Amino acid sequence: GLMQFTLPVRLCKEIELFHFDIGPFENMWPGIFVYMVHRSCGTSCFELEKLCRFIMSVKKNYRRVPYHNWKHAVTVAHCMYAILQNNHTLFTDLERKGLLIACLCHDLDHRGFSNSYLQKFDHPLAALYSTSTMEQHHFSQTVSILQLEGHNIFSTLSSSEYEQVLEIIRKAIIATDLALYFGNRKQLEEMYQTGSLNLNNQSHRDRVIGLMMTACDLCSVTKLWPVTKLTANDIYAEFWAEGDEMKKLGIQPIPMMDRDKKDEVPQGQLGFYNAVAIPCYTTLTQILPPTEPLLKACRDNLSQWEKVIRGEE
Template identity: 45%
Template sequence: MPSQDETVTRIPVETGTTVAAYVAVTKETVRTNNTSDDSRFPDGLSVDVQDVEFILTHPVLEVDGELVGIIELYRKEEDEEFQDEDEEVLNSYLLWGGIAFHYAELYTNMARQKKLNNFLLTLVSFVLGGFRVLITLLLLVYFQTFAQKLVDADRASLFLVDGNTKEMYARMFDVNEEAENADKTGDEATSKEIRQVNRFPVGTGIAGFVAQTGESLNIPDVYNDDRFNRSVDQLTGYTTKNLLCMPIFIRNRVIGVVQMVNKESGSFTKGDEEAFATFATYCGLALHHAKLYERIRRSQKKYMVALEMLSYHSICSEEEVSFVKDKPIFQDFTKLEEFTFPSYSLDSDEKVKATVYMFNDLFGSQKFDQDCLIRFIITVRKNYRRVPYHNWTHGFSVANAMYAVIKSSPTIYKPMEQLALFVASLCHDIDHRGKNNQFLMQSESPLAAIYSTSILEHHHFNQTVSILQQDGHNIFASLSSENYRKVLKNIKHCILSTDLALFFPNKAKLKTLIDEDSFSWKNTEHRLLAEAICMTACDLCSSSKPWDQQQETVKGIFEEFYEQGDAERERGKEPIAMMDRTKLDQQPSSQVGFLKAICLPCYEVTVGVLPNTKPMLDGCLANLEKWEAIAEEQKNKNEEATNNASE
């Protein structure tokens, strides 16, 4: 490999150009003293050499006749021209030189095979005894360092195939020594490494072609290949010249693609292909076992969650169904459609009967089995935990708010959409533990190991499906299979949208549509956005209730916050002020911030698509005014206490 101070001249192997190129093609020795007049090589010499008159160009061949190089000798005008004797002497030397090249290559191949064997032995030991660190080891250590050095490549890429989406994604992309050194020194400006997860359809680009066909590709000039995607080069400023790309198989199925880019000297050889093919085979085994371990780990976590659920919850009995059916009612359920209905005024069983009333009022009592409906609602109630806020009362309150929204605008949502919205509202916080997603991740909860995003929300939906699958609980049994699928899909969308992390992008999209007067109920995506924002509005409905209800709910909210703060402090982490029970004086200002940052923007956008929900916006504004007054009063008290302490 040339040093940094050396200049490397590359010439194409072809006739009709230079002397060296001609000899490389023909493997003939050439003696000449007037290259400018020779039609075989009109471009003369391949290198710039001064005062050259006589030239002797000789091919360097291995024992098997394969060309490994060209040697070119020069003499000046005052010297003698090359004779047959010179050619014979040179040929003798080059005969031994070819043998030397051959043995040098054998030694290089043996050394490379030794490194490959050592790598495979190490990899196998991890496959047999250390699944837990395998995927990290493979991607971050061996693939990064060994694979590149094995074939003398500048960069390395590993793409995995997602069989469900028929897409490929790069867990590690374009790793090179320059980027590795930059990471060690913290100099991000010199790093060209791309660590983001890139997804693209199978069949796209060279890697996609290899994944689709299962064929290996060794391409000496990628810019002359129509399959090459130049966008990455354009993005990074890096220039890809040649590459070696091979599929990773498991049971005759392509699960990934490994790709080496830009061999440091020349192009990738047959020897590189053979060595890399062995490497790719063992990569496949390693990835396969890593995926098996991940499945086992996820199954264990799900089993832990299931045991926890069984110890906490149960399904309803027939006695409970009969008791609720026979329970006398002392409430006027017609007031349920008012946005100001006090949810806490009903006891637990009355909430079940009120839910039955709302469900039948919206969808008809003749279409759904009533015992099944009661059984479903009671089991949903049982699956809400006895936590200060995210409990059965909250679930009922959100369902009641959605009922009021639908009743206020009965023709906006389609029947199947109304069904999904109401059931999603009722079930949206099933088995909530009184802790947020961030806490679950930081505490390494089994749930966090199962779901990578919207942890609680995914769990709430899956628990809803689990209840529907219990005997005598499937309230959707009368629906056609197509409507059943649609409702479940829509329920999932609605429950996931209650994750406040999704609220902000949803609100921004919907607000833009409203501001530009481009929102349309005929557009499916627009309808889904409206459903999502409506779910959030109902989830936050306590902020729009009359002041006495608002105060009652806030007590539960902050008690749940404080319990999480206590748990964080036990784990050695200082909780934020909102969750710190030693900072009760900051409750009013926290409420002001919450109403201004989340609740008001949510209701403003909701009213933009559902004007009849304006009572929720008005209620929120009224509560904000009261909280601001309390916050100002608390601020004055704090300042007075500070002044007294300083005197």
């Protein structure tokens, strides 16, 4: 109390932009997160001692995989922060509180494998959670960490405020299951077009917060081209390892996961931008107009993948 986090000038300003890159200095990421909570939620949302202890236990439970790591957690929270700060007055006090935490926690204890690999390996998590296998695990890890002594950042909330925030976080985290995204965006499309979209309807906020989660989760496609391209390398490093593991189980992996089919990456990025990213950011921009720079940067990065195919890089 009276203790602002502040950042150096270039970060203080660039952090407000959608395309911000949190940088290679790991020891600055926790401070970057606290700075975003303090400015998004207020310096009174969380007891600093408890928040710091929660952040460090969350960090310790991300693994050293090439993509689904602690840098991803904080990257997906920064995007969510930019959305919240550019749409200040559309979100409740409890939403602003839950959603950044949801983003920090959304991939907790990920191992670098798809729900499909879990299910074909017959991993124990695939018997406990038949659909959204990893995403039910991530929420489960969030509640475990919140119940450690000194880790309950939500202590000051009423019984009912506490239940509403754990439920915002659960739905936020489940929505990051891209299998759920296609149906969620189709329904959001129809509802905005027929004019039936209603932000007082809790089931409508739910869908809208779910789309925000998919947008933040995919936010490597909204960065400066060299961030986009270099993150892609991490992303394939996991897909190809998964593919290698599929081959070990006696299963031909999908092309996306086969390191033998590297040559086709450019065209696979095009499919993903056209089938997933662009429609995601299009529908999001319709509903929250100030998110348009996510759409515009996604478009620039698609045209960069096109250039790759055309031999221009």
